[PDB]
Amino acid sequence: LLDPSIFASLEAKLEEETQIRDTLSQLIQRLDRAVATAQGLLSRVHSTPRSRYPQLVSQVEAAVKEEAAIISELDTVASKHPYYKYNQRWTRSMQHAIGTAIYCAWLGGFPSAEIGRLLTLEEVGTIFSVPTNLKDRDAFHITIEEYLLSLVDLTQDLSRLATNSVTLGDFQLPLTISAFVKDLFAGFQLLNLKNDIIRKRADSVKYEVKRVEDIVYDLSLRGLIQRP
Amino acid sequence: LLDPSIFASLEAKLEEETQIRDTLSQLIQRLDRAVATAQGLLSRVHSTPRSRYPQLVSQVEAAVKEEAAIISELDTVASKHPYYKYNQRWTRSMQHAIGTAIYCAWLGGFPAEIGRLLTLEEVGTIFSVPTNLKDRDAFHITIEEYLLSLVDLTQDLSRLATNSVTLGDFQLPLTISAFVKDLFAGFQLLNLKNDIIRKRADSVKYEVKRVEDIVYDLSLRGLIQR
Amino acid sequence: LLDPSIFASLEAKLEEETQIRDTLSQLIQRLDRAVATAQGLLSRVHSTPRSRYPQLVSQVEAAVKEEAAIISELDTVASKHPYYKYNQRWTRSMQHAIGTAIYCAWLGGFPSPAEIGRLLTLEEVGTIFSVPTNLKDRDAFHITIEEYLLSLVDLTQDLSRLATNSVTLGDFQLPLTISAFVKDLFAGFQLLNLKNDIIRKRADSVKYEVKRVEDIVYDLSLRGLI
Amino acid sequence: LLDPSIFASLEAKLEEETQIRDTLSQLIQRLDRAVATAQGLLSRVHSTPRSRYPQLVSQVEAAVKEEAAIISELDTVASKHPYYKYNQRWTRSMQHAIGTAIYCAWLGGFPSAEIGRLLTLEEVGTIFSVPTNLKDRDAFHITIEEYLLSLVDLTQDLSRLATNSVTLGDFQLPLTISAFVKDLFAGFQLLNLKNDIIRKRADSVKYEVKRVEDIVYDLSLRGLI
Amino acid sequence: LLDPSIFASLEAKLEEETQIRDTLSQLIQRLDRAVATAQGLLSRVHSTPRSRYPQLVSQVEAAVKEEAAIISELDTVASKHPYYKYNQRWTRSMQHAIGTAIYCAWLGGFPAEIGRLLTLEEVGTIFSVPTNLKDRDAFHITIEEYLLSLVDLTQDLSRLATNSVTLGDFQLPLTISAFVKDLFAGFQLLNLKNDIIRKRADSVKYEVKRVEDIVYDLSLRGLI
Amino acid sequence: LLDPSIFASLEAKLEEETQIRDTLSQLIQRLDRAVATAQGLLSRVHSTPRSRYPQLVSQVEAAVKEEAAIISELDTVASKHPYYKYNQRWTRSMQHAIGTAIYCAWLGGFPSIGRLLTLEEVGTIFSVPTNLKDRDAFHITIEEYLLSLVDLTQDLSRLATNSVTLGDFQLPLTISAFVKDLFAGFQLLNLKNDIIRKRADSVKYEVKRVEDIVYDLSLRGLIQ
Amino acid sequence: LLDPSIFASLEAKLEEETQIRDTLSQLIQRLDRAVATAQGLLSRVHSTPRSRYPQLVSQVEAAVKEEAAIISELDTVASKHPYYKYNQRWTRSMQHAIGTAIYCAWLGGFPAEIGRLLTLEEVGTIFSVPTNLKDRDAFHITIEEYLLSLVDLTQDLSRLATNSVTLGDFQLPLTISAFVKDLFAGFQLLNLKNDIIRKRADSVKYEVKRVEDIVYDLSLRGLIQ
Amino acid sequence: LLDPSIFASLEAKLEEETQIRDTLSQLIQRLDRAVATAQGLLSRVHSTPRSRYPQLVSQVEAAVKEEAAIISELDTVASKHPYYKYNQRWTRSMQHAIGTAIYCAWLGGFPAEIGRLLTLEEVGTIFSVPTNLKDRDAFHITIEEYLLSLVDLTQDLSRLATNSVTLGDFQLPLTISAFVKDLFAGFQLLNLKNDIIRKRADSVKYEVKRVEDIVYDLSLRGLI
């Protein structure tokens, strides 16, 4: 006939897989709402003068910490199972959380308000209390890829921020945004990435580079920037 | 602004992943050629009489054994890296090799009895690899690979039943009917979450119908024990 | 700026819908396991002589009754929420359950050895499962005419398979009963006007089963077995 | 042999479904034509100065009222059958009518003029004399999803309005449009939109946000505000 | 600005389109019901001996005549508008009705000599509609409909031969074999250009093989 | 067999249909070449100042008249066989010719910048009926007219871009007004046919393009 | 500006490429028409008894030879230019020509041994062109073309077996079954790496099953032993 | 039964092609890294004044020279095999390398004479490889690769002009405009037939428009 364990152990495997999937779904939805909260808080930068950045940043610093709470729980649960089995379920949410943290620090938060600071991957790992993929460890961690993708998203956010900065009267913030996005695009081009998805999304930074360079061009043409 | 350690770590990770993927590709290709050899040897069953089975079986056994050799190397490599990071590269080839081994044993190999069904553990014994590992990250054979190989074997056995009636062996379709019916019963009684495996299991119904119609034809002519 | 009631009502809707979906999912999975048990039990008819039908039927009856247990629970839950908002989640399982009950009664079960060839009315199926049938003026969990007719379309295929295997088992009379049944059912389907092109296509698909059973009876008549 | 009651019940069911399909279809056609009239009336805002808005608004108001009339029939019909059995057929048309009403009120219409007013779902239900968010009763009603989708479409209309305002010499209207679309996008991102279709539309709102922000940027660059 | 006559003409055009669709759709529904009745009456030939053929034939004839009634009405409507604008709506139903008529005639109807093949002209006579209108735009019956109905009739007759052996009529399969063979010969000689009708006429080879296999079964058993 | 009449009638039908196809295809190819001539002449509006518009117009007019001639021949052939059996062959080319005529009149041609020929005026220019009902003959449809208008909007958007390039800042304003009003009419039309509805909603991209051109011009003070 | 030599060389390259296109296309058109002639000749095997196989075979042997003539000219032309620059233009036509040749020899042509499979070398002999040319750039026939033509041959032989049963030849389907079975076994032994070729070679499974079912039905009804 | 020579030749073919693919892949990866380094160096031109161009150019020159060091190796390997069998694997990387070389020379490298356009033969000399090879199968540089690198260079130079206005250099946009305009004139005079090359060459019009708008702004401010 057919040893019943063939269809029984399979059923037990699917049982436990579905249970872990549901637990991870709950965790990921909570993290997603925390990240949405931090993103909504960061959205206020588009109508907040630089002078009132310290008030916003602190608030964002709270929301990010909230994320690091849920992530912590995730770190436990996800570490009870292989990483490469259940990754690609949290990688997008973790990338967005990393993005909120990096945006917060760029606005003068999580110091270790200096606008323009780039958190290293290790600094993001410290803020979220999780290891990084700079080494291999076979546990729950954040990846270099998540970090780079979060940076790619940050460049689009920063292009929008420069456009709105010209509206708010801040004519110097577009210049630092331009320097940041230019240097990030240079690094992305020098990384020579193999994964076609991340290589494509990093090449897509050229549009943001052009947009911020055009903003600086416009400000220079009107004498609103003291460039050489 | 991007840290140099990111550049260095990404370069090293690319070197390592390229080397691992090259080794896995050459191993998987060697396994696929061995599996193709065993499959071509097994395909002769469609023109080989039952009396001449023990010859072919031995010839297939050797072929299967060859597979195992390559598999034993794959293990040694694959077990040094996370299983779920690279498993999707060999799962199809491992499934095909499991299928060749099960087909060989069904024809009387790896012990006389025509219709013997290797369990997952016997397959792992033949290939010298663990089966159904959970809390241990190492190269292994999955339940899913085994069941998919069985789904393929039912189609192979339907073809074999047709060719058997052509060759004059009227009792072999009865064995094939028993096997395919029991496999379909086991599949249907336990609805798999995986809807792709469920689709493949519904695909066994057609082979059940084919073999049952062969048995019907043979019964109408009094060629089968009732 | 949006009213905070938007955010509040959306989160409340999401929580409630998630709860209802989880409850209905577990109920439907239990019902599917019960229907699978009854279907496997009925599958034994392909290897059971008519003389040993009253035994099988009893088991199937028990199996069917187990379905009616879970269905009960389903009703209690599904009737608390709008029918047409969630009916697409259980309609296939309910169709399969209706099918198992109708098949059981065709083999001699659920009367009001036994008589082969009885067709349960939709009302009788509802009586068996203790659920309303064809509810037009009440939002409550019920069984639809479409589910019943689709289960009948499935029954014609199951019965064609049964006739083939009956000839295999030596029962040359059961194919005739099945031929009469399938032909009368196809006639009733032809007289039925079905707006829904899916139901109309599935009802036209009964022509292949009619042809197969007529071919079986032809084969038996040619050989002087009828 | 099938029971004759099955034939009879199936025939009766099919006749009823045909009745309801025809009635709902003629009602939805008439509502869609009223919506098209109100939409064409609203389209004049791209060529009308702010000073002449009260003339257009009233004309739009009447048109919206016309919509309500047809809706009041739809309600009466649609409430006689289960909501979730036929709601798929009018949800887009009802969303469009809600959108015309919200656009009219944004332009100063349906008061209790103030440019930029956002009708609540309850106010839309009041204008159309149908309930909203009827999460506990089987009757024709208006859903939060229809309202949010109409707002998504309103942002796309308002971006064009701001562009044409700069053409028409109105440099103060793009600013209010920018504030409105920005706050609506912020509310969209903060929402528990698990329905992926609504989530994709609320994400597509980003392009309109960028367009209006670029308009305000262009006005700031030239020292016009 | 667009002319108001465009809006008015479009509105009136669409109203008339909808009205013609509704009238047609209901007429096609009634024709489909009549064709289903005649088809179910004909299906009794699988459980009726040759001796009881006349009875059944009459029952089918009336049914066919019922079709004609509806078809007449269809004509009255369909001829008022361009044929080629709406022909795709009734072509399958008319093909089925022609098939029922030809089947009734094959069983000894509309003159009990079994195996009469109505050509296009007697079909048009039975349904009181023109056939193959070349340079006339009225509701008519096409050669394609006729040939497609004949292709369907071959499969029906293969089923009839299979069931005739069950009923004991060992001679009717011979007549059916001759008929299906000659019809397949005519089809192969037609050399149809459009691919659908050519494919459906080539599919007659399977029915030819089925009836020939019935005949060979009967010959092996001396039943012939 | 079946009937040799079937063979003969089918071969005659095939021969006649092939002859009609070939003559119609020759006519449509000639019409397409004439439409290409008119289109190339109209393309010069992207490189011609408004002061030099009359001459071009006259030339374009001649081209359109050429079209009419071929269309006349088409009208003579197509009217011998049923419309709705061959109209799919020429509907696209006729839509393009209508578009060229409407474009010409928009530039000032066929009188008695910015004029919209009514469907009846297009029919007058090409000497063919429009919106023909209750009569089978070659004619021009409302759908062809509206599709030609859809094409004209895109061509006019390109014209506005190239007018900004040439230094003509006033013509983009007229193009904007025209495309705005045409899109408003299109939206009020409620085209049931999904093809025409999709292609008429595709006008929103052209509306946005011309409105953005006017936005750029007004920001620069080049207009207001 | 841009160097004039760039213009001159690009004009010359475009002219030469166009002339090569025209020559290759006329040669390919003639070869395609000859292949179609041979294919129509071979299709008559579905209605030709074995007793009259020599006739047809000779008629095919001429047709194939005609193909070779055209191919000869192609060779010459195609050998002047790089092979891999223009090979994708004739590879399908060469595949079909090889197919007609192999079908001819299977019926008893180019030595009545029905079932003979020509080697690639024998195909090259028939068409007077090299096969599997490595480390030399000249017009040649490839292994992949030969194997693809073999797949097509199986698809034709299935139909031949069906029509042989219809004609009354019960012994030809057995030979077709043996041939197609062994060919599928060889295909599976090859482990073709190129994805399109492996897909087309696994598509032979269906033809194998069709012919095997024909043989099953024939043996069941006591027609073949 | 298939000939064993088929199996043998296919296995040998596969082994040889695998080795060639792997060698070409390592060579192309090293070339891509070198081109990425040279491109990152060149990107500094958007923050470097003209006064400090010779400092950058030198750094770029070495970079480009490093590319050549890899290309030679590629040249040695690829030339052992048919060109057109494997050219698609390296054509893009070679086009990018040619782009970096032409950009370096445009900035005053490989002779500060700003605006120099390397001929195809000069690029071949820099990379020590043939150009436009006819009548010999050897690794070489194509006219298509050169022109496509030029198409990319126009986008790079439009970005450079935008940043040049910001850095204060009001004369470099003028020379960039002259260069891009002459390149577009040549592309239009080329009448390319390959749809890919013709499309990519017509895409230069956007860059022409951008640099001409820059020059227009500068002239409106009296900086020209």
Compute the distance between CA of residue G195 and CA of residue G202 in angstroms, rounded to an integer: 10
Helix (H, G, I), strand (E, B) or coil at G131: strand
Resolution (A): 3.2
Query: Alpha carbon of C87 to those of B220, C72, C94: distances in Å?
Result: 46, 15, 10
Are the C-beta atoms of residues F122 and F145 closer than 8 Å to each other?
Answer: yes
Provide φ and ψ at G25, rounded to 5°: -70, -40
Say which amino acid occupies E188. Q
Structure-block tokens of residue A161: 């921020």
Are the C-beta atoms of residues C27 and C73 closer than 8 Å to each other?
Answer: yes
Compute the distance between CA of residue H110 and CA of residue H160 in angstroms, rounded to an integer: 20
Compute the distance between CA of residue F5 and CA of residue F9 in angstroms, rounded to an integer: 6
What is the 8-class DSSP label of residue H52? G
Provide φ and ψ at D132, rounded to 5°: -130, 145
Say which amino acid occupies D203. D
Report chain G residues whose CB lies below 8 A from the CB of H137: 82, 137
Query: Alpha carbon of F120 to those of A120, F126, H146: distances in Å?
Result: 72, 10, 56
E209 reaches G (C-beta below 8 A) = yes
Other Cβ atoms within 10 Å of E168 Cβ, number: 12
E99: left (phi over 0), alpha (psi -120 to 50) or beta: alpha
Are the C-beta atoms of residues D133 and D121 closer than 8 Å to each other?
Answer: yes
Task: Kindly report the three-state secondary structure assignment for every residue of H121-181.
Answer: HHHHHHHCCCECCCCCCCCCECHHHHHHHHHHHHHHHHHHHHHHHHHCCCCHHHHHHHHHH
List helix spans (H) across E44-142: 53-78, 83-86, 91-106, 120-127
E217 reaches C (C-beta below 8 A) = yes
C-alpha triplet F113, F114, F119: angle, nearest 5°: 125
C-alpha triplet E38, E43, E44: angle, nearest 5°: 105
Are the C-beta atoms of residues C85 and C139 closer than 8 Å to each other?
Answer: no
Compute the distance between CA of residue H13 and CA of residue A78 in angstroms, rounded to an integer: 47
Are the C-beta atoms of residues G57 and G108 closer than 8 Å to each other?
Answer: yes
Nearest CA to D219 out of A213, F214, A166, A214 is that of A166
Compute the distance between CA of residue C97 and CA of residue D14 in angstroms, rounded to an integer: 25
Are the C-beta atoms of residues E141 and E132 closer than 8 Å to each other?
Answer: yes
Query: Alpha carbon of A175 to those of A115, A155, H170: distances in Å?
Result: 12, 14, 20
Say which amino acid occupies E49. P
Helix (H, G, I), strand (E, B) or coil at H80: coil
* C187, C193, C211 member nearest E43 (Cβ): C187
Are the C-beta atoms of residues D129 and D74 closer than 8 Å to each other?
Answer: no
Q: How far is D167 from chain F (nearest CA, A)?
A: 5
Report chain H residues whose CB lies below 8 A from the CB of A184: none
C218 reaches E (C-beta below 8 A) = yes
Nearest CA to G141 out of G200, G195, G87 is that of G87
- Chain-centre distance of CA B185, in angstroms? 19
Compute the distance between CA of residue G106 and CA of residue G149 in angstroms, rounded to an integer: 13
Interchain contact, A36 vs D189, CB within 8 Å: yes
Helix (H, G, I), strand (E, B) or coil at D111: coil
* E39, E43, E165 member nearest C221 (Cβ): E165
Structure-block tokens of residue C137: 């003026």
Q: How far is A75 from chain D (nearest CA, A)?
A: 24
Compute the distance between CA of residue G73 and CA of residue B184 in angstroms, rounded to an integer: 60
Which residue bears the tokens 């060579």?
A: H27
Are the C-beta atoms of residues E99 and E153 closer than 8 Å to each other?
Answer: yes
CA dihedral F136, F139, F141, F146 (to 10 degrees): 180
Report chain A residues whose CB lies below 8 A from the CB of H39: 189
Which residue bears the tokens 């040359």?
A: C172
Q: Which residue of D has its CA nearest to A222?
A: D221
Q: Which of A 117-176 lie inside 8 A of D, CB atoms?
A: 160, 163-164, 166-167
Query: What domains appear along chain D, each with residue ranges and CATH number?
Result: 1-142 (1.20.58.190), 148-225 (1.20.58.200)
Helix (H, G, I), strand (E, B) or coil at F193: coil
Chains in touch with E (3+ beta-carbon pairs under 8 Å) read C, F, G
In terms of Cβ atoms closer than 10 Å to its own Cβ (0-12, 13-18, 19+), residue C73 is middle
Compute the distance between CA of residue D195 and CA of residue D174 in angstroms, rounded to an integer: 31
User: What's the full length of chain B, in residues?
Assistant: 226
**Strand-pair partners of G131:** G141
B201 reaches C (C-beta below 8 A) = no
Structure-block tokens of residue G152: 């097509």
- Chain-centre distance of CA D90, in angstroms? 12
Are the C-beta atoms of residues B161 and B155 closer than 8 Å to each other?
Answer: no
Nearest CA to E127 out of E110, E149, E147 is that of E110
Structure-block tokens of residue H152: 């990319």
F31: left (phi over 0), alpha (psi -120 to 50) or beta: alpha
Report chain E residues whose CB lies below 8 A from the CB of F10: 143, 190, 192
Chains in touch with D (3+ beta-carbon pairs under 8 Å) read A, C, F
Compute the distance between CA of residue F200 and CA of residue F189 in angstroms, rounded to an integer: 9
Compute the distance between CA of residue G31 and CA of residue G34 in angstroms, rounded to an integer: 5
- Chain-centre distance of CA E194, in angstroms? 19
Are the C-beta atoms of residues B62 and G220 closer than 8 Å to each other?
Answer: no
Query: Alpha carbon of G115 to those of A23, C154, G38, G104, G162: distances in Å?
Result: 64, 46, 18, 10, 17
Which residue bears the tokens 């999955």?
A: B142
Nearest CA to H100 out of H56, H132, H55 is that of H56
Report chain B residues whose CB lies below 8 A from the CB of A187: 1-2, 7
Are the C-beta atoms of residues C71 and C31 closer than 8 Å to each other?
Answer: yes
Q: How far is C168 from chain D (nearest CA, A)?
A: 27
What is the 8-class DSSP label of residue H1? -
Nearest CA to B224 out of B184, B169, B180, B179 is that of B169
CA dihedral D32, D36, D39, D41 (to 10 degrees): -130
Q: How far is C88 from chain E (nearest CA, A)?
A: 29
Interchain contact, C218 vs E33, CB within 8 Å: no
Nearest CA to G174 out of G118, G212, G220, G117 is that of G212
**Strand-pair partners of H131:** H141
Radius of gyration of chain F (CA): 21
What separation, in Å, do the N-terminal and C-terminal C-alpha atoms of chain F show? Answer: 84
Are the C-beta atoms of residues B39 and B75 closer than 8 Å to each other?
Answer: no
Q: Which residue of C has its CA nearest to E39?
A: C190
Compute the distance between CA of residue G149 and CA of residue G126 in angstroms, rounded to an integer: 15
What is the 8-class DSSP label of residue E132? S
Structure-block tokens of residue G75: 């060779």
Q: How far is G80 from chain H (nearest CA, A)?
A: 9
Compute the distance between CA of residue E147 and CA of residue D129 in angstroms, rounded to an integer: 60
Query: Alpha carbon of A9 to those of D10, D100, E73: distances in Å?
Result: 46, 59, 67
Radius of gyration of chain H (CA): 21
Nearest CA to E144 out of F17, D124, D1 is that of F17
Say which amino acid occupies F210. V
- Chain-centre distance of CA E35, in angstroms? 9
What is the 8-class DSSP label of residue F190? -
Structure-block tokens of residue G196: 């399109």
Other Cβ atoms within 10 Å of G168 Cβ, number: 8
Which residue bears the tokens 């364990």?
A: A5
Q: Which residue of E has its CA nearest to G222?
A: E220
Interchain contact, D220 vs A163, CB within 8 Å: no
Helix crossing, D4-43 with C122-129: angle to 10°? 90
Report chain A residues whose CB lies below 8 A from the CB of B1: 118, 180, 183-184, 187
Give every CB contact of residue A153 below 8 A, 6+ residues apart in sequence: A95, A96, A99
What separation, in Å, do the N-terminal and C-terminal C-alpha atoms of chain B show? Answer: 82
Query: Alpha carbon of C212 to those of B207, C205, E211, H186: distances in Å?
Result: 17, 12, 16, 74
A-D contacts at Cβ under 8 angstroms: 31
Compute the distance between CA of residue H109 and CA of residue D63 in angstroms, rounded to an integer: 71
D196 reaches A (C-beta below 8 A) = no
Nearest CA to E111 out of E100, E97, E98, E101 is that of E101
Interchain contact, F10 vs E132, CB within 8 Å: no
Q: How far is G1 from chain E (nearest CA, A)?
A: 50
E163: left (phi over 0), alpha (psi -120 to 50) or beta: alpha
Which residue bears the tokens 């919106």?
A: F131
In terms of Cβ atoms closer than 10 Å to its own Cβ (0-12, 13-18, 19+), residue H1 is exposed
Experimental method: X-ray
A223: left (phi over 0), alpha (psi -120 to 50) or beta: left
Query: Alpha carbon of D35 to those of A164, D41, D64, D77, D98: distances in Å?
Result: 36, 10, 8, 19, 9
What DSSP line would sit under E120-179, residue for residue?
HHHHHHHHT--BS-SS--S--B-HHHHHHHHHHHHHHHHHHHHHHHHHT-SSHHHHHHHH
Provide φ and ψ at H61, rounded to 5°: -55, -55
Compute the distance between CA of residue C29 and CA of residue C34 in angstroms, rounded to an integer: 9
Are the C-beta atoms of residues G187 and G73 closer than 8 Å to each other?
Answer: no
Are the C-beta atoms of residues H116 and H105 closer than 8 Å to each other?
Answer: yes
**Strand-pair partners of A142:** A132
Nearest CA to B172 out of B223, B96, B117 is that of B223
B213 reaches G (C-beta below 8 A) = no
In terms of Cβ atoms closer than 10 Å to its own Cβ (0-12, 13-18, 19+), residue E3 is middle
Are the C-beta atoms of residues E61 and E53 closer than 8 Å to each other?
Answer: no
Are the C-beta atoms of residues B111 and B46 closer than 8 Å to each other?
Answer: no
Compute the distance between CA of residue E205 and CA of residue B126 in angstroms, rounded to an integer: 51
Say which amino acid occupies F50. R
Nearest CA to E84 out of F128, F24, F74, F136 is that of F136
* A10, A83, A194 member nearest B143 (Cβ): A10
Compute the distance between CA of residue A149 and CA of residue H44 in angstroms, rounded to an integer: 24
**Strand-pair partners of B141:** B131
Interchain contact, F190 vs D33, CB within 8 Å: yes
Are the C-beta atoms of residues H207 and H180 closer than 8 Å to each other?
Answer: yes
**Strand-pair partners of H141:** H131
C-alpha triplet G84, G85, G90: angle, nearest 5°: 75
Say which amino acid occupies G7. F
Say which amino acid occupies D146. E
What is the 8-class DSSP label of residue C52? G
Structure-block tokens of residue E83: 């044929």
Among positive and negative, which fits the CA dihedral G102, G104, G107, G112?
Answer: negative
Interchain contact, E3 vs F118, CB within 8 Å: yes
C33 reaches B (C-beta below 8 A) = yes
Q: Which residue of F has its CA nearest to D35?
A: F188
Say which amino acid occupies A203. D
Structure-block tokens of residue B74: 């794959």
Chains in touch with F (3+ beta-carbon pairs under 8 Å) read D, E
Query: Alpha carbon of C200 to those of A78, C134, C153, E35, E153: distances in Å?
Result: 49, 19, 11, 16, 22
Which residue bears the tokens 């509609």?
A: E129
H84: left (phi over 0), alpha (psi -120 to 50) or beta: alpha
User: What's the full length of chain G, in residues?
Assistant: 225
Structure-block tokens of residue D145: 């999803």
Nearest CA to F185 out of F167, F203, F206, F168 is that of F203
Other Cβ atoms within 10 Å of A25 Cβ, number: 11
Chain breaks in chain A (C to N over 2.5 A) after: 112
Interchain contact, D36 vs F188, CB within 8 Å: yes
Compute the distance between CA of residue B71 and CA of residue A178 in angstroms, rounded to an integer: 54
